[PDB]
Structure formats: C-alpha cells, structure tokens
C-alpha cells in the first residue's frame, strides 16, 4: 500500500492550494481535540451547578429547562459531524475513481474531480455560517450568574444561581473564534479558485 | 494486501449506484457516532430524574416501570446491530467468492452476487420500517413534564415530575429523521435496479 | 501476508457449508456486542435496586444473597468464553498445519482437519445445551416485582421490592433466543455433514 | 513480515508437544479475560460491603484490616504477571537467535533452545504451586457471612456482617480450578519430554 | 512503506542538529504524558476542595469564581495543542514535497524546506514565552491555604479553606520547569543555525 | 519493514550482554504494568480514608497536608518517565545512524554507538539511586494506623485514623524491591563491559 497511497494523495489534492491542503485539516482537528479533552470538564455538571432557592416540587426542573433547552456540548457534537459529511463523500468518490483507472492506465475524468471539490466547499460554507447564527441566538457571548424564573408550578418569582460563569464564558468565545477562522479560510479557498470571475458573469 | 483490496472493492460494488456505494455507508455511520457520543448524556440518568411526591414503599418503582418499560438507549442499540447483520453476511459471501476464483482466474458467478445484493436491501427495508413503527408506538414525538400514576401499592393518584423534557424531545426527533432517510435511500436503490419492471409483471 | 491469509481461509473452510462459514460467526458476534453495549445498563445496579422494609442489621444482605446467588452478567461472561475455547484450539491446529506443508508443498493431512472440525461442533453442542438448562433453572423467564424472605437474622417475614422488572424480563428472553439459534445451527451443520448416516449404523 | 513469522513459529515450537503448543496458551488467556471482565464486579466494593455495629472512632478500620490484609484482586494480578516473566524471556531469546542465523544460513544452536524451554517450565511449575498454597492459606474455600473482632480501639467484642458471600465463594473456587489445570498440564509437558528417564538416573 | 519512510525522515531532518532532532521531541512528549497521567488526580476536584464558612445562598460560587476564573488543567491543554500547530503544518508541507519529486527524481526545492523550519521555531518561541507569562500572572509559584473574599452577595468578609496546597504547589513548579527547558532548547537551535550572523546585519 | 527491523535490532544490541538485552526490558515492563493495574486500587482514595475526630473548620485539611505532601502514585509516575528519557534518546540516535549508512553501505561509526550505550546506563544508575533515597526519606517501610497532629487552626492535639495500613505497607515494599533489582542489574551490565579496568586506572 505504498504506491497506492502515493497516487491517491497526489490526485485528491492536485488542484487545491495550500490553504485547503494544509491549513484547513489542521484547523478542524484542533477543534475536535479541544472539545473532547476539555469540554466535559466545563459543561458536564450544569444540572447540579444550578441552585434555586425554593422547596416546591418541580420548580427547579421547570426553570432549568427554560434556561437551557439544549446544552452546548450537544450542539458542538452535531456541528463537527455534519461538517464532516461532505468531506467523507469526496474521499470515497476519489477512491473509486483511482481504482477504475489503474486497470487501463496503470479530460472527462480530471474535470470530474474539480466539480466535486467546489461542491463540498459550498456546502461547508453554508453549514458553518448557519451554526454560528444559532450559537449566538441560543447562548450569546456570556453566561450569567443569576436567572429569574416566572414559570409554573413556581409560586411568584424565584432566584437561581449558577457556578463557574467565568470559565464557561471563556470556552464559549474560544469556540466562536475557531469556527470563524474555519469559515474564513473556506471562503478564501473558493476565491483563489476563481469565484470572482464566476460571480460577475 | 494492496492488489487484494483493489479487487474486492471493485467486485463488491461493480453493480451498484452511487446511492448504495457512498451515501448509505455515510448515513449509517452518522447514526452510530451520534448515539455513542451524545446518547448517554441525555438518557443515562432517567431513573434519578423521575421524582414522585409520596413516601409509601414501592410506589416510585411501580410508576417508573409503567412509564418506561424499555429505555430508548436499549432500543437504538438493538436497531443498529440488527441492520448490520445482512451487511455482514454479504461481505463474507463476497470474500470467499474472490478467493475461489484467484487460483483459476488470477456468468454463473457474476450473477450469484447480484441476487445477494437485492436480498440484503429487502431485509434492511423490512427491519427499518418495523423499527420506526415501534418507536412511534412506544415513545411518540414528545416526552412530557408530568405523569399521573394509579397503580398498586400506591394509595390514590400521585403526581410525578420529569427533568429535561426539551432536550429529550429534540434528540428523539433527530433520530426519527436520520432513520427515515436511511429508509428512503434503501427503497430508492431498489428502484434504480429495476424494481418497477419486476413490480408490474 | 497476502498470499498466506488467502491460503488459510481456503483451508480452514474447504469442507464446511455456508451455515458454519457465514451464519455462525455472525450469530456469535451479535451476542457479544449486545452483552458489552447493553448489559451493564440493565443489571449493573441490582444491589441498590433491592429495597427491603426493615431496620435490623444484616437482614437485607441475607435476603439479597438468597434471591440472587449469581448475577446474570457473570453467567453470560463465562458462557461466551467457554464456547470460544474449542474454536481457538481449531484455529491454532490449522495454523501450524499450513506451515509444515509450505516448505515441501509450497490424504492423511486433509483427513486430519475434518476430524477436528467435527470435534469442536460436538463440544459446543454440549456446552450450549447445558448453559440453557442452568439459565432456566436459576432465573426462569420472568423477574418478579416482590420477594418474601424468611431468613435469619430477620425477625418474622419481610417484604422486599425490585426496580425495573419489565426491562430485565425483556433482556433475559432476548438472550435465551439468540443462544437457541446458535444451538440450532450448530446441530444443523452436523446433519449436513452426515450425522444421519453415522447415527443409524 | 510473512516469511519471518513463518520461521519463528516453526522454531519456537519445533520441539514441543500439542499440550504446550495449543492447550497452555489457551488456558492462560482464559484466566486473564475472566479476571479483567468479571473480577472488579465481585470484589471491587469490599470496603463498603463491610458493616460493623458500633460507633467508636476507628473500630471499623481496625477490624477490616485484620480480616483482609490483602484483597484477592491484588493477589491474582501479581500471579499472572509473575508467570509471564519466564515466557517473555524465552520469546526474546528465540527472536535474537533467528536473526543471527539468517545472515549466514538464510547442533550447538538447536540444542541451545531445548535447554531454555525446560528451564521456563520448571520455573512456572514452582511459581504456580506456591501461589495455590498462599491462596488456600489466606482465604480458604469459603467467604463467611459474619466476623467477630476483638481488637483495639474496639471496646468488647463486636459483630460485623458481609454482603454477597455466595457469589464471592463461587468466583474463588473457579480460579482455584483454572490454576490447578495450568499446573497439571505444565507438569505433564515435562514428563512427555523425558523427565521420567532423568528422574531415575 | 519501508523505502518511503526511510526517505521522509532523511529529508525532514537533513538540515537540523541533534538538539532539534532528538532532544525536543522527547521533551514535548514528556510534558504530554505527565499531564494526562497525573494532572486530573491533583486538580480534578478543586470545586469540592473549596470550603467556605457561611450559609448565605450563592456566596461560595461567587468566591470560587473570583479565586480561579480558569483552572490550570484547561490552560495546559490549550498550550500543548497550540505549540503542535506549527509542527503539524511543517510535516504536511514535507510530505507533499516528497511526492512531487518521486515521479521525476525517484536547489529551489532544498532551499524551500529550510525557510519553513526556521519559521515554525520562531512561532513556537513566541507561543512558549507568552504562555509562561500568563502562568506566572494567573497562578504564581504557590497555592495558598486560605482566601479572603469580600464579594456580593456575601455579607461582610468570610474565610475559605483549601485542601492539598503542598501537592498543587509541587506540580505547578514542575510544569514551569519543563516548559522553560523547551523554550531554552528552541532558542538554542536557532543560534546554531546562524541567528547570530543574521542578528548583527 | 522486514529487513529494516532485522538490521536495527542487530545494531542496537550487537555490543550488549543478555543482562541488558533480555532481563532489563522485562524488569522495567513489570514495574509499569503493576503500577497501572494495581496502583489506583490501593492509593486512590487516601483522602476519604483519613478520618480525624474534630469539628473545627479546616483542621482535617491541615493535618492531611502535613502527613502526605505528595502521594506515592505521583512519585512513581515521575520515576518511570524520567528513567525512560535516556532510553528514548539512544533509540533515536541509533535509528538515524542506520539510515545514513544504508545509502552507501546498503570504525568511527561502530565506536560511536558504544559510547552512547555507556552514557545512558550511567544516567539511569544515578536516577534510580536518588529515587530510592527519596522513597525511604518520604514514606519509609511502613504506613501507620494513627497520626498525631498539632497544627493550626486545630485547638490542642487531635487523633486521626487511617484505613488499610497493611495493604499499603505490602505494596510499598514490593516496589522498593523491583527498583532495587533494576539498580543491581544496571550496575552489573557496566562491570561486564569493563568498568573494573577503567576504575583502577
Ligand atoms: C440562523 C438564525 C436562526 C433563526 C432562529 C431559528 C429558531 C430555532 C429554534 C430554537 C429553539 C431550539 C431548537 C434548535 C436546536 C437544533 C439543534 C439540533 C442538535 C441536536 C443534536 C430554542 O428556543 C427558542 O425559544 C426562545 C424562548 O421562547 C428562547 O429564548 C430564550 O428564552 C428565555 C426564557 O425566558 C431565556 O431566558 C433567554 O435566554 C431567551 O430569550 C431561545 O432559545 C429560542 O429563541 C426552539 O426550542 C423549542 O423546542 C421545543 C422542544 O423541541 C421546546 O419544548 C416544547 O415546549 C415546552 C414548553 O415551552 C415544553 O416544555 C416541551 O415539552 C415542548 O416540547 C420549546 O419550548 C422551544 O424551546
Ligand atoms: C504576557 C503578560 C500577560 C499580560 C496580562 C494579560 C491579561 C489577560 C486577562 C487575564 C484574565 C483571564 C483571561 C485569559 C485566559 C485565556 C486562556 C484561554 C484558554 C481557553 C482554553 C484573568 O483575570 C485578571 O483579573 C484579575 C482580577 O481583576 C485577576 O487578579 C486576581 O484577582 C484577585 C481577586 O481578588 C485574586 O485574589 C488574585 O489572585 C489576583 O489579583 C487576574 O486573574 C487577572 O489579572 C481576565 O479574566 C476576565 O475574564 C472575564 C470572563 O472572560 C471575567 O468574567 C467577567 O466578569 C465577571 C465579574 O468580575 C463576571 O462574573 C463574568 O460574568 C464576566 O464574564 C472577568 O471577571 C475577568 O476575570
Ligand atoms: C409495528 C407496529 C407495532 C404493533 C404493536 C406491537 C406490540 C409490542 C409490545 C410493546 C411492549 C414492549 C415490548 C417490545 C420491546 C421489544 C424490543 C427488544 C429490544 C431488546 C434489546 C410495550 O407495552 C405495551 O403496553 C402498553 C400498556 O399496556 C403501553 O402503553 C403505554 O401504557 C401507559 C401506562 O399507563 C402509558 O402511560 C402510555 O405511555 C402508553 O399508553 C405501550 O408501551 C405498549 O402498547 C409490551 O410490553 C410488555 O412487556 C412485559 C415484559 O416483557 C411487561 O411486563 C409484564 O407485565 C408487568 C405488569 O404489567 C409486570 O410488572 C412484569 O413483571 C411482566 O413481565 C408488560 O407489562 C408489557 O409492558
Ligand atoms: C442442566 C440442569 C441443571 C441441574 C441442576 C444443577 C444444580 C447447580 C447448583 C445451582 C446453584 C448455583 C451454582 C451454579 C453456578 C455455576 C456458574 C459458574 C460461573 C462462574 C463465573 C444455585 O442454588 C440452587 O439452590 C436453590 C436454593 O436451595 C435455588 O433455588 C432458589 O431458592 C429460593 C430461595 O428461597 C429462591 O426464592 C428461588 O428463586 C429458587 O427456588 C437455586 O438457585 C438452585 O437450585 C447452587 O448454589 C449454592 O452455592 C453455594 C455457594 O457456592 C451457596 O452458598 C453456600 O450456602 C449458603 C447458605 O445457604 C452460605 O450463605 C454460603 O456461605 C455458602 O457458601 C449455596 O447456598 C447454594 O446457593
Ligand atoms: C537523596 C536523599 C534526599 C535528601 C533530602 C532531600 C529533601 C527534599 C525535600 C522533601 C519535601 C518534598 C519535595 C520533594 C518531592 C519531589 C518529587 C517531584 C515529583 C512531582 C511529579 C518533603 O518535606 C520534608 O519536610 C519534612 C517536614 O518538615 C517531612 O518530614 C515529615 O514531617 C512530619 C510532620 O510532622 C511527618 O509527621 C513525618 O512523616 C516526617 O518527619 C518530610 O516529608 C521531608 O523531610 C519538601 O516539601 C516541602 O514542600 C513545600 C511545597 O513545595 C511544602 O509546602 C510549603 O510549606 C507549607 C507549610 O509547611 C505550606 O502549607 C505550603 O503552602 C508551602 O508551599 C513544605 O511544607 C515542605 O513540605
Ligand atoms: C506456601 C505456604 C505458605 C506458608 C505461609 C507463608 C506466610 C506469608 C505471610 C502471610 C501474610 C500476608 C503477606 C503475604 C502477601 C504477599 C503477596 C504480595 C502481592 C503484592 C502485589 C498474612 O498474615 C498472616 O497472619 C495471620 C494473622 O496473624 C493471618 O491469619 C488470619 O488472622 C485472623 C485474624 O483474627 C483471621 O481471622 C483469619 O482469617 C486468619 O487466621 C493470615 O493472613 C496469615 O497467616 C502476613 O501479613 C502480615 O503483613 C503485615 C504487613 O506487611 C501486617 O501488618 C503489620 O502488622 C499490623 C499489626 O498486626 C499493623 O497494623 C501493620 O501496620 C503492620 O505493617 C501484619 O499484621 C501481617 O498481617
């Protein structure tokens, strides 16, 4: 499997720039290691870190579900696997293309791989942009220290306190930045292919 | 093992379309990673998240068993391994077929693999459809916030409250959708082989 | 290791039918994945799910040991490793047979492997049948919701309640069925070899 | 690494019988899988399963240390790694012997490996026999349900109760039996080499 | 993949000294194993090891967030992955360079790899120096045993006590030293390449 | 990678005796497996196994930090990775030496590897001896059952009790012995190379 892999890497990346050949794979692996290693330590115990000052039955569960209908740990897991779906389809389409041309040749084919590369960058551009909008819409840029809750079966208005709001705010902003750079260099690799000339006409 | 694997991939998928060659393997791996990474965080602590307002001995255990006789985590594990049984039989039948034709040839054989491919898609079509029916029948499309229980040895009617009903509802619908697309593209790969012509006559 | 493995697979299974070549390995792997993935979630916390209504010292430990002298998780682990012992001896006997005939040949030998295949199916037939009898004898087909205990140092008769009896009953029956099919297809692979002709005379 | 491994297996086991070539490696792997999979579930929580009926400070810790100065989980881990030390020295001595005879030959050497095989079986025979004696001496064949303790700083004599004495007794006897068969087949493989003729004269 | 890897190692390190070829990879792996094996045992339970003498609601969470807005475990994880980003870009740039010169040759190229090696050492020099400054700025060289907190909603001034301040002080200084040696030998490998001659003119 | 590894093993160990070729690698792996498998079970819960008879705030944390400023689990992890640093530098220096002599030769070089082997044994001799001195200095040969503590903010003198002092004493002595044999056979492998002749003159 020495000559095989030396012919797949030169075919999968014979029409890309260094931005899409080196810098994007390293940026996407950075986001994956950071989430797996450090994520559960910050956001793993949100439920026990949510203290409400009351004794009615069912008032804490009603207020925590209004504050966080979805945890950030679940959102970020769905984001990394969605963005990997276009990349996995292009790697498989390239694998089977190399096999059906070793037998005979151990134009119409070389132009077939270029249209597939432009298609997965356009999809990743749409999925990354939509994820950032939901992230700002659901959570924002800061996690508060208190929360007021007027919800049934709570009688009146109660006060609820959170733990570690400074460490959660720092991890939230760090993710927004890594995803922003992934979006920027994906849009840049299209321009260098000639999106500008296609844009005008 | 370079020339061997280059002859098994071209034989196992020399009579399939891109729907069954690229899109289905990526859809089935998506469902497996999502379950392993995110599943236990949502549904792992159902039993401690089920609070009933009483003190009789044995009334909580009676009401939780009426509400959830089977957890969704157990249902989804059985679903992914069943659907993988037809795929594992077809990969082994193809392996031994390549070995018994290398010795001599390093019709009746090529037509033997086509009838085996149609057979595992028909089985997966029946198993996916039956699983969705049980899923809607057992759980539905929403997890409630309260539950009324009139069961022995509880005296009267008691009220029991749940935690995180919004995050559980979102994960339930997300699975129903991924399985629906797996069912759709399995039915589609039969049509493109000629199920329509076989259907009429 | 390409030509080597292509000569071991054709020798280990040159005298077996598809029942013993494809269907049995897939059935035994199914039982192993199901136990590892789902087993601990059902039967992992039996001891804390066993509530007795008393305060004497040592009455709970006396009644739980009378009810479950052995957990199902321990029984099923011993069952899968025992059944794998005859399979591991036959794979090693075949490995060393291929090596001592590559040097010279790169009758008395081909007939040596056939008597070893019949011997491990007979052993697995005896071990699977004995395990099912103990399983029905120890546990049965249903896990109850209550249990009466008259044992020292308990004064009188006490009542003890269990949790999740419906999910434990479903997992118990599912295992009995998978093992039953493993027993059936092991007995069937002997008939197709000629057990009937050997039986009569 | 195809021809290399086909020459090491034929050299490491060209002067052994099937008892030492197939049956002993399978017996030693059986004991290792059983310990790792099932061991912690039985003996992992001994300390919390040891209830003494008192309130003095330090009386429970004094009585548990008199009852179990060493857990069975620690004893069995030391036993499996000690017995593996002679096996690892013989595999390395054989590896370097094959390399220093490929260059030239790609009597005094063949007789060098026979004296090393007899030496590791004699060591394993002494280590297995000593371990069984300590096992019977420390623990016995049964784990009791009660324990009387007259030790300082306990005032008088107190009673302490154990949990799950029936499951611990079954696992203890199962290990004694597997180790007994390992001892038997190690002594048998020496006889078949000619220990009887060496014994007399 | 024998001749391939024998040509990549000689190309990636044909213009480096033993300081950058042996000593730096071993120093960076030392810091990674130490963090993974020993880190969580020291700093994993800071929150439960922070006891404040009060009963007001929300005073403990306010004082722990002022004392530790970021844990050392999170800081050190970000430090090791950042420093690995320049190393991963240089390994990929070297891989694709070897492939595009095997076809033709199975000056302008040899000089292309030298400017890339100087660039990743300069980046690692800036990232290591900035991390040490933040480490001294956030934590210092010692973890105290007490902490005074005048913060809302605490009434007055309260006293809070810490656990294991001696083991945390020892692990903190040990990390500062390993990172200091990584900084020293990175600056030294530039001098031996000729930074002094470039510095003056 | 068959001929490559057959030339590295014969070069890395063409000037060593069986003591440094077989017996030392097996002794160092023994110490690593024993620590990983059995270590956390003995010394993992020291903090909860340290009971002091008082109610003042902060007196338990002050006395446990005086008794154990560093756990044995942390000491032994640092000891095994330090001793592995000289071994990792010598394996890398040998790898690059084999590559720069395959091209030409597929005296000054053979004598270069001998001075590197003597250098890593001298370093390991100094690191093993210093570790044993700290081990006896910090912990000793026995773990007590009680401990008297006169430290602020404790009023007077209090008594604190430990759990499992017999199992901790046995594991401590077992490690001291394995490290002693590693020190002995490292000093012995220098003598057999000719340290005696170098010592006198
Ligand atoms: C590109 C631009 C985007 C444009 C907007 C797009 C809008 C998208 C909708 C956003 C969405 C999450 C869904 C997306 C997650 C997908 C991720 C999938 C990953 C899976 C791996 C968040 O909910 C919205 O609702 C707002 C409140 O109304 C929230 O505002 C905050 O509110 C303040 C409270 O005071 C806060 O104090 C403040 O912080 C904000 O003001 C926001 O979170 C958001 O706007 C919708 O959630 C909805 O889900 C359902 C259950 O499915 C919820 O439960 C249902 O109703 C419950 C009774 O209510 C029952 O109990 C439950 O039984 C029932 O089921 C709903 O209730 C609702 O929550
Ligand atoms: C190369 C030379 C460096 C030159 C200096 C550079 C300055 C860098 C800033 C350092 C920085 C950490 C950020 C860096 C971490 C990046 C790592 C990323 C890794 C991610 C994987 C530490 O905070 C600074 O602030 C000082 C206090 O003011 C602290 O001093 C100590 O204080 C004494 C208390 O009495 C101690 O007793 C004593 O020990 C020290 O005196 C120091 O920690 C430091 O100086 C800034 O933190 C800031 O973050 C934000 C939330 O983002 C915090 O929360 C916000 O405000 C809260 C109300 O306040 C709200 O509640 C919260 O809702 C809101 O959000 C802020 O509050 C603030 O903390
Ligand atoms: C393709 C179309 C499908 C067509 C329908 C097919 C029908 C399939 C039957 C569905 C099935 C699960 C079995 C399938 C799981 C297989 C998965 C295997 C994976 C393994 C890896 C769910 O049970 C049915 O029963 C209904 C209630 O009667 C439930 O309705 C809900 O009820 C409302 C309550 O008020 C809820 O409020 C509301 O939410 C619903 O109204 C539904 O869950 C369902 O209809 C049958 O369960 C049965 O199992 C047995 C124990 O085996 C149970 O325990 C036995 O009886 C106990 C005393 O009772 C004893 O204590 C126990 O000792 C004894 O043993 C039974 O009791 C029964 O539960
Ligand atoms: C092919 C056809 C099979 C033909 C039958 C073959 C008979 C096989 C014997 C079955 C066997 C398990 C052993 C097999 C497990 C091997 C698996 C190895 C895997 C290891 C990886 C189950 O015990 C039998 O005994 C019966 C009770 O007498 C049980 O009936 C139930 O009882 C009702 C109670 O009221 C239930 O309510 C109801 O549910 C049933 O009526 C059944 O479980 C069974 O019949 C024997 O167990 C025995 O083990 C010993 C300790 O070794 C036990 O402890 C000893 O005595 C204690 C004082 O007693 C002391 O405290 C203890 O200190 C001492 O040591 C014994 O006590 C005894 O239990
Ligand atoms: C080759 C021959 C060796 C020759 C001797 C060499 C001497 C080496 C010094 C040994 C050393 C460990 C350091 C080595 C570990 C490196 C391992 C690195 C691995 C990392 C992966 C043990 O401390 C010494 O001190 C003695 C006490 O003074 C101890 O004796 C025992 O005491 C009896 C009590 O009554 C016992 O009852 C009895 O059992 C013994 O009598 C012994 O442990 C030892 O002698 C020094 O520890 C020092 O560390 C610092 C924090 O860094 C400690 O904290 C500082 O002060 C605190 C207020 O005090 C503050 O609270 C804290 O905030 C502050 O920071 C110090 O306090 C001090 O402890
Ligand atoms: C081939 C034939 C064998 C021939 C016999 C050879 C004899 C071998 C000695 C056996 C040995 C274990 C050591 C072997 C483990 C090596 C495994 C290594 C694996 C490591 C990976 C078990 O101890 C012996 O002592 C007996 C009691 O005296 C025990 O009997 C039982 O007692 C009844 C009580 O009433 C029971 O009710 C009943 O069940 C039995 O009657 C038996 O366990 C045994 O005979 C010796 O243990 C000794 O260790 C030391 C600490 O090192 C212990 O602690 C020391 O003293 C404490 C004050 O005492 C202090 O508190 C402590 O601070 C101090 O340190 C000692 O106390 C002592 O225990």
Residue numbers in the entry:
A (entry chain B), B (entry chain A), C (entry chain F), D (entry chain E), E (entry chain C), F (entry chain D): 2 to 107, 127 to 221
Paper text:
Connexin family proteins assemble into hexameric channels called hemichannels/connexons, which function as transmembrane channels or dock together to form gap junction intercellular channels (GJIChs). Human Cx31.3/GJC3, which is expressed in oligodendrocytes of the central nervous systems, does not form intercellular channels. We determined the cryo–electron microscopy structures of human connexin 31.3 (Cx31.3)/GJC3 hemichannels in the presence and absence of calcium ions and with a hearing-loss mutation R15G at 2.3-, 2.5-, and 2.6-Å resolutions, respectively. We also found that the hemichannel has a pore with a diameter of ~8 Å and selectively transports chloride ions.
Two mutations R15G and L23H in human Cx31.3 have been found to cause nonsyndromic hearing loss, and biochemical study in HeLa cells demonstrated that these mutations inhibit ATP release through Cx31.3 hemichannel. To confirm the ATP transport activity of Cx31.3 hemichannel and the inhibitory effect of R15G mutation, we performed the ATP release assay using purified hemichannels. The result showed that wild-type proteoliposomes, mutant proteoliposomes, and protein-free liposomes retained ~100, ~500, and ~500 pmol of ATPs, respectively. This indicates that wild-type proteoliposomes released most ATPs during the desalting process, while mutant proteoliposomes retained ATPs in the similar level as free liposomes. Compared with the wild-type hemichannel structure, the R15G mutant showed some changes in the polar interaction network between NTH and TM2 and notably decreased the basicity of the cytoplasmic surface. However, we found no major structural change and almost no change in the pore diameter at the cytoplasmic entrance by this mutation. This, together with the ATP transport assay, suggests that ATP molecules cannot freely diffuse through the mutant hemichannel in the entrance-covering NTH conformation. Because the pore diameter (~8 Å) at the cytoplasmic entrance is much smaller than the effective hydrated diameter of ATP (~12 Å), this conformation would not allow ATP to move through the pore without substantial conformational changes of NTHs. The hemichannel structure showed that the entrance-covering NTH conformation forms a small pore slightly bigger than hydrated K+ or Cl− ions, suggesting that the transport of metabolites much bigger than ions would require a conformational change of NTH. This idea is further supported by the ATP-impermeable R15G-mutant hemichannel structure that also adopts a similar NTH conformation. However, it is still unclear how the wild-type hemichannel, but not the mutant, could change the NTH conformation to transport ATP.
